[PDB]
């Protein structure tokens, strides 16, 4: 964990995030939806649960991106919840929830659900 | 369970469903989105898991509604997954997934998630 988590991760669709795992549970970094442009970039923040493992368990973690920067304000935020698995083919497997701000009439359509896998390659 | 499940159920928003729980695990009935009109009515089908309980456990169940009838075809289907709890204030507590048919470009926006509680009153 920690050192294994620090670095650049890529999903299937071509989004990228860069994250530092700090000593006491902190995750900080940036998410780029498209690896071309210098602002599809958004701030990310989260937490991971460091633990002694003797059985090859994953490391539980989570992070949030609010979809606002200097070029775009999409009135929404996503959370990813999942686990880090290290080794020669390290990956982070996640499920995600994306919520949009709605009126109260429309609150039943506010939250989409999906899943993502990130690899180092 | 079974006999306790058979009957009319109402959620917070005012939708209604009427269900028969058959002897070997079957749930069949109809869902009306609005209890006024004679077709906001859609077919429902599902299953429940009957079991001897000695500890006051709920009965696990699930059902599907495809949103097509003679007046409307909304190109979508919802599943509800949850449990029946009986007694003087019987309720069914559920979480749901609503999926719309999309092109492959739009498949990340295809599934909404939410929750519902049904009571007899």
């Amino acid at each position: 964990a920690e050192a294994g988590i620090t670095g650049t991760w890529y999903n299937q669709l071509g989004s990228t995030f860069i994250v530092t795992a700090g000593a006491d549970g902190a995750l900080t970094g940036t998410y780029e939806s498209a690896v071309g442009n210098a602002e599809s970039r958004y701030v990310l923040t989260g937490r991971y649960d460091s633990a002694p493992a003797t059985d090859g368990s994953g490391t539980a973690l989570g992070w949030t991106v609010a979809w606002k920067n200097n070029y775009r304000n999409a009135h929404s935020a996503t959370t990813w919840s999942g686990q880090y698995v290290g080794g020669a083919e390290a990956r982070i497997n996640t499920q995600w929830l994306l919520t949009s701000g709605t009126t109260e009439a429309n609150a039943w359509k506010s939250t989409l659900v999906g899943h993502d896998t990130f690899t180092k390659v | 369970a079974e006999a306790g499940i058979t009957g009319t159920w109402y959620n917070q928003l005012g939708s209604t469903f009427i269900v028969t729980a058959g002897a070997d695990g079957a749930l069949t009935g109809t869902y009306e989105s609005a209890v006024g009109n004679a077709e906001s009515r859609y077919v429902l089908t599902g299953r429940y898991d009957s079991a001897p309980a000695t500890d006051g456990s709920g009965t696990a169940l699930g059902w599907t509604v495809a949103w097509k009838n003679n007046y409307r075809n909304a190109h979508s289907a919802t599943t509800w997954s949850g449990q029946y709890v009986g007694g003087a204030e019987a309720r069914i507590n559920t979480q749901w997934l609503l999926t719309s048919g999309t092109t492959e470009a739009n498949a990340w926006k295809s599934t909404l998630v939410g929750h519902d509680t049904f009571t007899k009153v």
């Binding site: 939806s33 958004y42 991106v65 979809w67 775009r72 999409a74 929404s76 996503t78 994306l98 | -």
Partner: peptide, 6 residues
């Protein structure tokens, strides 16, 4: 074209 995807 939500920023998560595009």
């Amino acid at each position: 074209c939500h920023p998560q995807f595009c």
